[PDB]
């Protein structure tokens, strides 16, 4: 199968996308109530606008790719007066980026971003969407290095 | 239909997204590693659970006023025979009178009797009891749901 | 017949119930996802396994005095290169003499350095090792299960 859904609880899902190669923790964080097919298509709705988004910035399939990588973690949602959801994605540049270049990805990350999650609009799912962007460096040669390493999703597990 | 996990081999969770049930499903006695005969055992008290819904009337009516009979985790004896607990909710307004609850309960035990065939052995040659937890909600809450997350504490 | 689910990226729980086998794959040394060729090579060592079981004793035979061979976890190492600990239990029956013990202890040993491929790359290009606990239980106990889930406390 091309997506594996477990619920851990009610309201605790993970996702593995193995076909896109992603992985989002889906929290129904504000009710607690049991996440439902409209929550988890919502899931992989956003999980395909930062892929896209990463698509708009460069490839990253390409044998050296020098980044930036924009990976979404959780997508938590908010069901209990309006449908909101916030999207935590992770920005990974590389360790040698210079000041500038940092400054650079994340404003575009976050430009692309806007447009692919429909950031304050009601999406197709009725869906309003914010994101928080957090910033990594790692050395994007290694091979430590995974964008989507088990360490980046302590937060929401 | 419905999505089942396990998180230990004896602990298995298992959301029915068609019926908008979710059930912990334990092999509590033993700890054996659940089998596909105990998914189906599961399966069939969650469907039982919700019939004696509809007999205590339609969940899904806006305006219902309850009670609502939720099933929260079906746990195995597998040791010597074939035996379940199967543990539910009885979510009751909070605008009710004593008489109002002890008389849902009543209701509700009834229906469960039957719709789980308690202290008989059914088509899996499983014997069944339940357990009932009674709880008090404003059913017309924003912030109501009758399978929240925190109502299953005790079986996570 | 297999339910896999992910407790987190690099930690997934696979039960197989044809087979009647459970293991945890866990992509420790990285710590990154496990993907559909880390969860085909941990189908393949659990096959490995239950066929290093059908060298030492057809385990099911009504009656079966032991041993047991049973895989626990599957910990892959894909840092650098591509490797596998295979973490297994054997588990003899309680009332054993030393020397039956040792005998089923090289038994297996060796079966399993040649079902799971010890030291060399298998079809998978992963070039595989394991690790061995010594069980003992009383294997006509009813309260006995080859998996019981107390077995995988250390993985979970």
Same mark, same amino acid.
């Given at each position: 199968?091309?997506?594996?859904?477990?619920?851990?609880?009610?309201?605790?899902?993970?996702? +593995?996308?193995? $076909?896109?190669?992603?992985?989002?923790?889906?929290?129904?964080? +504000?009710?607690?109530? *049991?996440? $439902?097919?409209?929550?988890?298509?919502?899931?992989?709705?956003?999980?395909?606008?930062?892929?896209?988004?990463?698509?708009?910035?460069?490839?990253?399939?390409?044998?050296?790719?020098?980044?930036?990588?924009?990976?979404?973690?959780?997508? =938590?949602?908010? =069901?209990?007066?309006?449908?909101?959801?916030?999207?935590?994605?992770?920005?990974?540049?590389?360790?040698?980026?210079?000041?500038?270049?940092?400054?650079?990805?994340? &404003?575009?990350?976050? &430009?692309?971003? +806007?447009?692919?999650?429909?950031?304050?609009?009601?999406?197709?799912?009725?869906?309003?969407?914010?994101?928080?962007?957090?910033? +990594?460096? &790692?050395?994007?040669?290694?091979?430590?290095?995974? *964008?989507?390493? =088990?360490?980046?999703?302590? =937060?929401?597990?």
């Amino acid at each position: 199968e091309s997506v594996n859904t477990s619920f851990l609880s009610p309201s605790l899902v993970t996702i +593995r996308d193995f $076909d896109n190669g992603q992985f989002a923790v889906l929290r129904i964080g +504000r009710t607690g109530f *049991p996440a $439902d097919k409209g929550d988890i298509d919502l899931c992989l709705d956003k999980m395909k606008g930062v892929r896209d988004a990463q698509q708009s910035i460069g490839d990253d399939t390409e044998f050296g790719f020098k980044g930036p990588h924009i990976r979404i973690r959780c997508v =938590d949602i908010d =069901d209990k007066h309006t449908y909101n959801a916030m999207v935590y994605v992770d920005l990974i540049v590389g360790t040698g980026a210079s000041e500038v270049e940092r400054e650079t990805a994340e &404003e575009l990350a976050k &430009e692309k971003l +806007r447009a692919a999650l429909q950031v304050d609009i009601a999406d197709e799912h009725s869906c309003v969407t914010q994101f928080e962007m957090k910033l +990594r460096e &790692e050395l994007l040669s290694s091979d430590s290095f995974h *964008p989507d390493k =088990d360490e980046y999703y302590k =937060d929401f597990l």
